[PDB]
Design a protein around this ligand. Structure first.
Ligand SMILES: COCCn1cc(COc2cccc(Cc3cnc(NC(=O)CSc4nc(C)cc(C)n4)s3)c2)nn1
Ligand SMILES: [Cl-]
Ligand SMILES: [Zn+2]
Length: 296
């Protein structure tokens, strides 16, 4: 009695073009931005922790902690300059979600990424739940002030190596990324409680589903909702060592979860092609990439 006629990408595409599939939630992570040249800073294999040197951190994780930032912001802002991407060109995967938006299918995109590429690709703040915050805006950290600053202002401070301070009150100005010791954006749980009542398809792209709050979203889907994972590696299965709601791709009881294992851009391209959207997607990506490349 399942909604997918077969547990494959072709099955998902037929479901998407059926009357039953109207609202798509995307869950996306660092794997949709690596092909844009932005490494996964949460991966230990990236080497963030060996890069930290002259910063006499009481513990390597201090550079992610809010209380350390507020007393000693200089290490963070030096790391931000070192890690600042050289260009912001969203991927095929980002523009695929813009197509979902254009066609009225996008309920929400939940993202673990801070790189703003979802917004550059044309998702609006209403479309987005940035589970780890974003560099897109910054705020003065004084509770009585909270003056907002755009990324252009923050970029200029970061590159000139001037610690950003509020023009109204001279407190520090912090990018709206969620540091250790900061609470999750309240919109995360509000949107989660409402969105998963309405979802017809969960599209999971470029995330290992290991880090909170993402490590629990797939269990919020209704039991019937198909869940497509487009990812280099299988993810989201129950961990046998910790004793549900996990991905079941391959058992005889599997009925709704599909894994497409490969590069995220190639999987999204394959899905768009099945849907008849390949020309639309190519035209959009090439136009937006050309526009970004021509920035003067
Ligand atoms: C380990 O996880 C702990 C949990 N946690 C916390 C968070 C939220 O994020 C952070 C919170 C605190 C500290 C950092 C360190 C970084 C600073 N800058 C980084 N930049 C990138 O990596 C490339 S994107 C980019 N885009 C723009 C527009 C500008 C720039 C500079 N960079 S990383 C991240 N997420 N997960
Ligand atoms: Cl993760
Ligand atoms: Zn201020």
């Amino acid at each position: 009695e399942r909604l997918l006629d077969e547990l494959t990408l072709e099955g998902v595409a037929r479901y998407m073009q059926s009357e039953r599939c109207r609202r798509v939630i995307c869950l996306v992570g660092a794997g949709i931005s690596t092909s844009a040249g932005i490494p996964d800073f949460r991966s230990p294999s990236t080497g963030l922790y060996d890069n930290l040197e002259k910063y006499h951190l009481p513990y390597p994780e201090a550079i992610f902690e809010i209380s350390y930032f507020k007393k000693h912001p200089e290490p963070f802002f030096a790391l931000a300059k070192e890690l600042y991407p050289g260009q912001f060109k969203p991927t095929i995967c980002h523009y695929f979600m813009r197509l979902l938006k254009d066609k009225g299918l996008l309920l929400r995109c939940y993202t673990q990424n801070i790189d703003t590429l979802e917004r550059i690709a044309g998702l609006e703040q209403e479309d987005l739940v940035e589970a780890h915050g974003t560099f897109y805006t910054s705020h003065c950290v004084s509770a009585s002030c909270r003056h907002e600053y755009p990324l252009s202002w923050m970029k200029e401070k970061i590159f000139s190596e001037v610690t950003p301070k509020c023009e109204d009150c001279q407190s520090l100005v912090k990018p709206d990324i969620v540091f250790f010791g900061e609470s999750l954006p309240a919109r995360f749980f509000s949107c989660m409680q409402s969105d998963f009542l309405k979802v017809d398809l969960l599209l999971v792209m470029g995330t290992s589903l290991q880090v909170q709050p993402f490590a629990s979203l797939i269990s919020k889907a209704p039991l019937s909702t198909p869940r497509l994972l487009i990812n280099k590696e299988k993810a989201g299965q129950s961990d046998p060592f910790l004793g549900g709601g996990g991905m079941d791709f391959d058992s005889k009881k599997a009925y709704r979860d599909v894994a497409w294992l490969g590069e995220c851009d190639q999987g999204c391209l394959a899905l768009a092609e099945l849907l008849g959207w390949k020309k639309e997607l190519e035209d959009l990506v090439r136009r937006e990439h050309a526009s970004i490349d021509a920035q003067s």
